[PDB]
Write a protein that binds this DNA or RNA. Structure first.
Ligand SMILES: [Mg+2]
Length: 477
RNA sequence: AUGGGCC
RNA sequence: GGGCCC
């Protein structure tokens, strides 16, 4: 995005500067080059002179203004993707009720009750519970008044900036590159679920290459589906953006919202409006009040879907801006927000697409480090998606998601107080696909201290998950 | 202390 | 209630 004006205001907003993450018994063993992100300006692990505030917002470096020709091309790509999207999903995108928006529906989880309320409720000292009844799915007088203001389209707000407390690479911690969460008001989140929650539920149900979205997927089982798909194509590309979310130019966001969320596709007129309120935002970080134009605020509501949609349109745009006669069937892809895997039988020059992405404000690089630029001849087993490689299970013959051993080590090195036993069981579900030997090594430090699931048990559970009838068939002997 | 999924 | 990924 682009920082248009920063101001100092009396109403302070205390950002939390104290990590919940602590080292584990594995930290001594593995010694990862990872650590909790710096949450304080006076963190000793930082480098001298590093001001944590100026680094956080340095991602905002401009709002790329697209030319008329580029904007016209983008709309055609947005309309063409929207056409494909609503062909698969349908046009049953009518507003969710207040009840269904809170409680959720099949395909869409319920709203989190014990989480940040946003502004100006945190200032006033009232949490989500006081404003919204989550059991019965009704709302108090505060939210209901705000809900009507959004119908009238005279609702302004501020995003509350939280520091994201997480494990990050030591290079990023030393640099002061802590990620941030833009906490919007709970009513904005509710109303956004009202306008497009049906659509969102629908995209979770229909995740896959046909719509180019993995939001809603279960890597455990869906890796078989995605793996076999991308194996059929000659070339595959693992593309990486830098600061994807921030570099969504306002022009692109507006066009996308105009083309995807039209009334003729079964949406409410305010579906576009509420989404367009994300383009120009005001962020509240302590005494600072930073107005921003461009980019997407994380923790919005449909941010994964919105980013994923934009990702699809970018590829169609970039290819159409370099090659002639490109349709959606010229290539295939799957994305989860900024994360993206693309494939095609055509020998597409992705190196030559680089400057065409810079017209949108985005900067693309190959996920592979050593190779100097994009190259042809890569397959699905070379790339990475959702932090997982595509490996073949030689026992079942299915594809399985394998995370790098360093990532698993780093995960296991840190944990919140009194949640380690519950975390170990969760992490085992990921680590199982690394193989019996690597699995045993990963959980070596915890033996005796905690309960560790057997490789056997998690493997058998997985086989039933990917294909139930296969598991019963394996009982032939 | 997080909308989005996902045992 | 927790974890993973975005
Ligand atoms: Mg990638």
């Amino acid at each position: 995005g682009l920082i248009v004006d920063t101001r100092d205001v009396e109403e302070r907003v205390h950002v939390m500067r104290k990590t919940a993450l602590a080292p584990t018994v594995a930290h001594g063993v593995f010694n990862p080059e990872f650590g909790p992100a710096a949450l304080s300006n006076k963190d000793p692990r930082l480098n001298e002179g590093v001001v944590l505030d100026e680094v956080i917002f340095s991602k905002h470096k401009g709002d790329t203004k697209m030319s008329a020709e580029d904007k016209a091309l983008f709309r055609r790509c947005a309309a063409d993707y929207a056409s494909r999207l609503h062909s698969v999903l349908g046009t049953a995108n009518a507003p969710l009720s207040i009840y269904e928006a809170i409680k959720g529906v099949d395909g869409l989880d319920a709203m989190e009750p014990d989480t940040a309320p946003g502004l100006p409720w945190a200032l006033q000292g009232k949490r989500r519970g006081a404003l919204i009844d989550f059991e019965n799915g009704t709302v108090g007088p505060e939210v209901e008044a705000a809900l009507k203001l959004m119908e009238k389209r005279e609702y302004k707000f501020a995003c509350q900036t939280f520091l994201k407390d997480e494990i990050r690479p030591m290079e990023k911690v030393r640099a002061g590159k802590t990620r941030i969460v833009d906490v919007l008001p709970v009513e904005h989140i509710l109303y956004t679920r009202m306008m497009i929650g049906r659509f969102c539920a629908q995209m979770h149900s229909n995740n896959g290459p046909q719509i180019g979205s993995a939001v809603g997927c279960n890597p455990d089982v869906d890796w078989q589906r995605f793996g076999t798909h991308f194996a059929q194509y000659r070339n595959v590309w693992d593309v990486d953006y830098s600061a994807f979310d921030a570099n969504h130019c306002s022009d692109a966001m507006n066009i996308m919202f105009e083309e995807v969320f039209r009334t003729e596709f079964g949406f409410h007129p305010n579906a576009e409006w509420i989404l367009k309120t994300l383009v120009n935002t005001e962020h509240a970080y302590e005494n600072k009040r930073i107005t921003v134009e461009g980019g997407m605020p994380s923790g919005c509501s449909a941010t994964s879907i919105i980013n994923t949609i934009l990702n699809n349109i970018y590829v169609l745009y970039a290819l159409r801006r370099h090659y002639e006669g490109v349709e959606l069937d010229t290539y295939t892809m799957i994305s989860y927000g900024d994360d993206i895997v693309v494939a095609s039988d055509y020998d597409l020059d992705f190196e030559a697409l680089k400057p065409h992405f810079k017209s949108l404000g985005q900067t693309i690089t190959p996920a592979d480090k050593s190779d100097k630029g994009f190259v042809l001849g890569h397959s699905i087993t070379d790339v990475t998606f959702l932090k997982r490689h595509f490996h073949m299970d030689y026992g079942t013959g299915f594809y399985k998601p394998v995370m790098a051993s360093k990532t698993l080590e780093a995960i296991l090195s840190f944990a919140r107080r009194g949640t380690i036993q519950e975390k170990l069981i969760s992490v085992a579900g990921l680590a199982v696909h690394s193989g019996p030997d690597e699995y045993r090594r990963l959980f070596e430090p915890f033996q005796g201290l905690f309960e560790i699931p057997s490789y056997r048990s998690l493997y058998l559970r997985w086989v039933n998950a990917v294909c139930g009838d296969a598991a019963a068939a394996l009982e032939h002997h």
